[PDB]
Ligand binder design. Sequence first.
Ligand code: FDA
Ligand code: FDA
Ligand code: FDA
Ligand code: FDA
Lengths: 368, 369, 368, 369
Amino acid sequence: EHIALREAIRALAEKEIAPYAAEVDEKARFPEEALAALNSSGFSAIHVPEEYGGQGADSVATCIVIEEVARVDCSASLIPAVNKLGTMGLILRGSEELKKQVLPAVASGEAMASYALSEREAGSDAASMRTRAVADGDDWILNGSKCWITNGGKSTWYTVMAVTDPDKGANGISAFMVHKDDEGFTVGPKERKLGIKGSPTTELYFENCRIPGDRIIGEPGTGFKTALATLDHTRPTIGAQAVGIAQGALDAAIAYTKERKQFGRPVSDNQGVQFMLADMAMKIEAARLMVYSAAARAERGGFISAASKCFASDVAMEVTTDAVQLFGGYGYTQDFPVERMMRDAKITQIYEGTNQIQRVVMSRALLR
Amino acid sequence: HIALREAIRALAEKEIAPYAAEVDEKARFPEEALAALNSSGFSAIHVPEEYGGQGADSVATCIVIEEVARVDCSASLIPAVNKLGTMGLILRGSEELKKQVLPAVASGEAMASYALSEREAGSDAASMRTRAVADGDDWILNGSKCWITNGGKSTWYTVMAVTDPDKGANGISAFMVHKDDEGFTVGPKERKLGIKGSPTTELYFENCRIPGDRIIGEPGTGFKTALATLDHTRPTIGAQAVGIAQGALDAAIAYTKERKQFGRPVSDNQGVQFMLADMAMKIEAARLMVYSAAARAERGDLGFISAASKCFASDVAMEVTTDAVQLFGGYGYTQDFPVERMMRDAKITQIYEGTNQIQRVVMSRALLR
Amino acid sequence: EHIALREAIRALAEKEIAPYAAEVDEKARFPEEALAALNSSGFSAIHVPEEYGGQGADSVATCIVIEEVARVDCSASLIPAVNKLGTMGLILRGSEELKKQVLPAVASGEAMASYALSEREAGSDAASMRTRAVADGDDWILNGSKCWITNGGKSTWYTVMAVTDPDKGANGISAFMVHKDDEGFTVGPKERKLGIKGSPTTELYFENCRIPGDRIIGEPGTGFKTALATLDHTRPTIGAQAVGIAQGALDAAIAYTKERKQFGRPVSDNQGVQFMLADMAMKIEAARLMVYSAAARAERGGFISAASKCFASDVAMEVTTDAVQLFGGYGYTQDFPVERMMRDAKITQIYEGTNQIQRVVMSRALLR
Amino acid sequence: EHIALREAIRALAEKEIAPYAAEVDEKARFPEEALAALNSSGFSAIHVPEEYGGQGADSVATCIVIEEVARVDCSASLIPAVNKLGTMGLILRGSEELKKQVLPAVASGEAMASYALSEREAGSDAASMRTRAVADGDDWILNGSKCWITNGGKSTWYTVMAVTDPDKGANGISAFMVHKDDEGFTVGPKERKLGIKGSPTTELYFENCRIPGDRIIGEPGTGFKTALATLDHTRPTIGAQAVGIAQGALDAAIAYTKERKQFGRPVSDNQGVQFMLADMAMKIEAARLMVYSAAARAERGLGFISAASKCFASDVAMEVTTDAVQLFGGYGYTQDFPVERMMRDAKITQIYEGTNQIQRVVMSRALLR
Ligand SMILES: Cc1cc2c(cc1C)N(C[C@H](O)[C@H](O)[C@H](O)COP(=O)(O)OP(=O)(O)OC[C@H]1O[C@@H](n3cnc4c(N)ncnc43)[C@H](O)[C@@H]1O)c1[nH]c(=O)[nH]c(=O)c1N2
Ligand SMILES: Cc1cc2c(cc1C)N(C[C@H](O)[C@H](O)[C@H](O)COP(=O)(O)OP(=O)(O)OC[C@H]1O[C@@H](n3cnc4c(N)ncnc43)[C@H](O)[C@@H]1O)c1[nH]c(=O)[nH]c(=O)c1N2
Ligand SMILES: Cc1cc2c(cc1C)N(C[C@H](O)[C@H](O)[C@H](O)COP(=O)(O)OP(=O)(O)OC[C@H]1O[C@@H](n3cnc4c(N)ncnc43)[C@H](O)[C@@H]1O)c1[nH]c(=O)[nH]c(=O)c1N2
Ligand SMILES: Cc1cc2c(cc1C)N(C[C@H](O)[C@H](O)[C@H](O)COP(=O)(O)OP(=O)(O)OC[C@H]1O[C@@H](n3cnc4c(N)ncnc43)[C@H](O)[C@@H]1O)c1[nH]c(=O)[nH]c(=O)c1N2
């Protein structure tokens, strides 16, 4: 049934998404065509449970959607990937009352969700965040700022971490759902980036941002716990994204090298090139299987998830650098897509925990 | 599958691991492993149940090979070569011939070898020179083979020989040869880098007459059957490599936690932590791709995935075992610890059942199809 | 002596080139400030012999100039690197009469030179070029086109290879000096590129382009020999450029990781980060030494030059990918330069012969 | 001068050393033929200053000798590499009076020297050594033990580090010349090893080993400082050894792949093989140039470059020798050819004279200073 799912999303991606991926990048503009196609086909947030009108897709299927979209446009693949990132905490730990306000809109395609953890002085060290939430009667008052927020300015709902008790450290962070129209909440300017150019990446500001008491996810002081829980059920989807990029770059190189002739023969006739292609495909398949395994394990209940994400992203970086190479001069131009794929691949090694952090998680598990 | 793993690991750690050092040091057959594998029925679990076998699925067979290789790679070649030396027969042999051979392999009474390579026909196996000529209702084998794993310990041998020099690879046939067939002899063993205890021998055929029913499938399909065999066996060498790497990593985690320099375990250093993470991450990717390739082989382009799984796992093992020696420091460079042997053993996995260059030829041909 | 030279070029590069490098990339425009500073300091073409008013510098000194410029702006470094690429053939084999017309202007900074070998269907396989030259009276008539031409539209002089006898293969190719003002010579559109964005990269067209008989370089039929000789004396300079990029990336990462704190300490206090920095610096220094050795050997009169170029560029691709990684999220933005350095490093593996071609060259020598 | 030196050592090594290398390794016995030839040709310790009867060769020339010996026999290359390691401290910091006693014998080939720093609990963390030296009138009494000692049992002179003040940490360590005939000094059993098998690698024991006051190198408490300075001047020579091993591996692979024919053509006719050969040679030359640069700078008047030269070259040798075994296929995995031994030998170069993890500590400290 994943065979059929893959055929469906690939057909959708190639027809409605792929033709605009070069513009989305070149012009650094939101992938609107992709959003419309994902929303109307119901592929924008398949992970949302059926109870809220979602597909209730299993975790492997969700990875397959992200991977197949990323295979033609990595900025577009951040629509389903951050929809998951921005709703996973709520799903796992949120109250039914809160879930009902948010999930049906994400499930139906009416709203996107973003995830707001990071701050200028708190990236890898997320627990040193400075944004705070102070109770005030029935409300929470948010003050501070966040940065690196994917789909900032396009999302309707934001999962936002803030300090509710500074003296409890990691155990004094809470998570809140913030709506875009909430007073005191503003979206900052977009970053200029190496790749995923069309994906808006913004600062956010909270100046006495008053939100209802029902917006808190779980008990106060459980926000960091929830952040870690979020990442366990999302890191493989960034692995799936890296796998898709890699696959698209390999697909392009195979097609091009077969058709491009030098020395009176296809450049793919040269065993140096054949071996490079083999190495790219071998590692992509290994990375894909570890992604799916990590995803299936997460669903059923740190090592495998960090591994799947670290490995697939390392693989995508090598594969896309090789794919640019196999096109020769044309690979270095915007006329072909592999140049964009290479710039996009680099982010997968950085967000949803840097690959150095993934190695920290992995080694801690091995050595415990 | 978990219960299988627990059972084979216990046997390997209890009955095989204590002899692994001496197996290598003396370059002598792992007899203790053979007795334990044979009597607990772990030596050839792939043989179909119709012939007295466990009829285990191909992933189960990989897990057995992997868990044995984790403690002794020479020993792992008992089940791995039991499979190599019977797979052609299982795939393409007649009931009449299968019934003669497989029950003894199924029971642990007989090991099987696979005799394909010659001095001048390694990668280019189709250029082999050993001949088979039809005589009445018999075949007369003349020639020699080399690099034959478990040579001199095996009872049954799958031998390829030319039936028609004119027909190229379409003029190769495959035959089951028995240790007691007259004019069949075993030559000297190779002096090797690793898997030192696995006998690796030449074989001689001197007017070696065998019954006509010994042929596997039709005359001239022997190379085709050789290629199909590798499709179904390449992942098991992947599994072997995964096992070796796992054992090297297990030894390095245990040792780096215990060994202290500068007032703390050597594992306390982030450079060592990252290297351990790299080892484990890559081992798990290799493992999953081995099991996937095995699952797909059993169900019926296995070409790409089986070559991939063998090539990647063996590359991973080489890197992991090189690292594990490194993590022990000077002790890792001594025979006092097993990681030195593990490194030496890991190297063969990149070479046999198709060198990793040949694996890349198979993979790229599939992609460029 | 070279120490003094390195100090001078570095000071020049820091003060007059570096402040414009971001803008040169972001606006994809020619590094005009770098041109003015290099021309007036006399750093634009120091390889030109003294006989023509040039500096007459040794080949290592030329590499150090290219390296130190590439350390702050790769597009800018193509000024001296392609001034060299576009005059070496002439210098090695051209008549005195021809050299007197071209070289003094390049030496004085009045003219830039370009090198025009490649065509759409003749890249790695340059010998299959289709641009034609036909003798007509005392002149040559050139017809056809070239592409990938660095500094196209900015150069005054172009070294152009063309077929003079179609039946002689590589031995029926000649090389000619073409002047930007020659009738029937026109410059095409600029490529849109992954990196080195400010370096113009253009098609050229020859439409009954009539040039004097004195424009041929050496004897008819020796043009390809002269192209191969050029690469022998230029490939180490692309190694030098890749060393420069890598060094700038490493300088950046050292400065940033010392100042950026997470978990209460500089990120450079992590041993994984320390080891990565050690790896970058070790490979850079190996690459640098092999470049200078190739340069010294070429100048005193295939393997070492191909090795110096392949190795340094593979190193720079690795080092710049790591430098982006070590800046974390900031590395992925245009606010810092490591992202530009990564995009730029990729070209070094492709031009003046792809690293695959370099391995053809090397293995042929080993196996001779 | 260097072109000629290289030619002279290469010819000597090919004639007098190469023919014995396989036996030295296989039988784990000292390379006696190489010692005799290096001694009588005057190549055993060319770094020794002219003032003590030595050749007084520059540091690049000393690397070239070590490199070209290592190219055919790594164990034999440890004669001049360790003759340098076990005298450099003395040369740099010792009194004229002591130098005159030790250096002429090393210069003339009458004596080998060893370096005795490491202990079972003091490897990377050498400053935590436990061997003590106690003053007794004008003399010193040594008590403790060393391990990992190359050429132990063969050397005549040993540079030994010992604690002279347990309260001063690293500044409580001293260095002493110990003679093989000093009473209370004994040599323990040899390690069994992955490679450099013919190189003796021993424990040493000091039991009330009384030595004269003139045997101390430099002032008391500066022995560890002397250890660090020594490594600055010797690390490139292990880079040079790794470069020789890799060069021998590459040379062997070139000659072999050109002559081994499969599929109707030399195996070197395949581009995947050509490219690997190209990668091997390119990295070897980069490694060589950095070693010579490191050596040349050490001589002139260094932390970063000596560590980089050794780390890079040893990493290169490990990759290159793993590749060279691969390129021989089956034959590479056998003792019939030398690439298997070269592979085993390469591994030590990443470990001794400071592991490559320690080299990265040293490099990164210099970068972040
Ligand atoms: C385009 C884009 C998009 C997103 C994001 C980033 C970017 C660039 N992120 C933020 C992302 O998760 C974040 O960038 C990483 O956690 C890394 O943090 P810093 O950028 O602060 O680097 P930081 O300063 O943490 O790291 C600097 C370098 O040091 C290394 N390092 C740090 N600690 C180390 C340690 N203990 N050991 C070894 N090395 C260590 C790092 O690996 C890195 O190489 C995000 N966030 C969010 O909340 N919502 C979002 O939607 C997104 N989306
Ligand atoms: C920005 C920029 C700037 C310049 C240039 C290019 C670019 C992109 N070049 C042209 C450059 O030298 C050219 O891109 C390369 O020679 C490769 O040619 P193709 O782009 O046609 O790739 P091509 O189609 O040759 O190669 C495609 C792939 O096949 C591989 N391949 C080809 N043959 C192979 C073989 N036999 N064995 C193994 N692999 C093989 C290649 O390595 C590559 O990965 C140039 N030119 C010029 O005349 N003047 C200039 O100034 C410049 N400058
Ligand atoms: C210990 C041991 C155990 C066994 C075996 C070997 C060994 C060493 N073998 C034999 C094994 O399968 C054989 O060694 C390989 O197929 C390679 O053949 P050669 O050793 O002749 O190397 P060969 O000479 O074919 O290869 C030499 C080098 O050239 C490369 N090469 C060759 N052709 C190439 C091409 N077209 N493109 C790129 N590169 C190419 C190879 O990759 C290798 O690097 C075997 N056999 C058997 O019948 N029964 C058994 O039980 C075993 N077991
Ligand atoms: C054959 C042979 C020959 C010689 C030598 C060894 C051998 C095997 N040695 C000793 C050698 O120098 C010694 O093995 C190394 O210094 C490493 O010490 P240990 O073996 O105790 O490993 P140790 O236990 O120190 O290291 C184990 C692992 O931990 C790692 N590690 C340790 N500290 C670390 C840190 N701070 N950060 C990151 N990683 C760290 C190491 O890199 C290694 O990977 C020697 N000695 C001598 O005195 N005279 C001699 O002649 C020779 N000869």
